[PDB]
Amino acid sequence: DNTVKVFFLDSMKFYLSLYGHKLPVLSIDISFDSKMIITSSADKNIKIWGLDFGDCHKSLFAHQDSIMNVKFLPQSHN
RNA sequence: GACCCACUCGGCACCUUGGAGUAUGGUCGCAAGGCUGAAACUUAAAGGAAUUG
């Protein structure tokens, strides 16, 4: 049920429920310095997501059948 | 008893002599406002559009 839920770790107190992919999102990554997450679904459109409130930045589109896994170069934010 | 003709009485009947418009800078509601999906996202599938590609 095409959503991404972010919980904390000291409490797990349901920090951010978010949506908008129109298919089951199947890969998540989190920025190396805890500032930006990357959600990716099977509608060929990844979304770079802001963190403080959950504002989407670029709902960008590639890989013309389906994204299967996204991962983070953990040195810079690429 | 019936039929005809005249008369007569009573019947169901018959025939002939403020609104209309228009106008509204007011009061109140309202089609008002655009390819949907679709936004903080220029983003999918599926559609309507116009399509002699």
**Distance (Å) from CA A64 to C1' B44?**
10
Instruction: Indicate yes or no: strand B within 7 A of the C-beta of A48.
Output: no
Resolution (A): 6.0
Q: Which of A27, A31, A26 is nearest to A78 (CA)?
A: A31
- CB burial readout A52-72, b (16+ within 10 A) else e: eeeeeeeeeeeeeeebeeeee
Nucleotide whose C1' lies closest to the alpha carbon of residue A48: B41
Does residue A61 reach within 7 angstroms of strand B, measured from its CB?
Answer: yes
Please tell me the experimental approach by which this structure was elucidated: cryo-EM
Q: What is the rounded distance in angstroms from the CA atom of residue A45 to the CA atom of residue A30?
A: 17
- Rounded CA separation A70/A19 (Å): 18
Give nucleotides in strand B with any atom < 7 A to a protein C-beta: 37-45
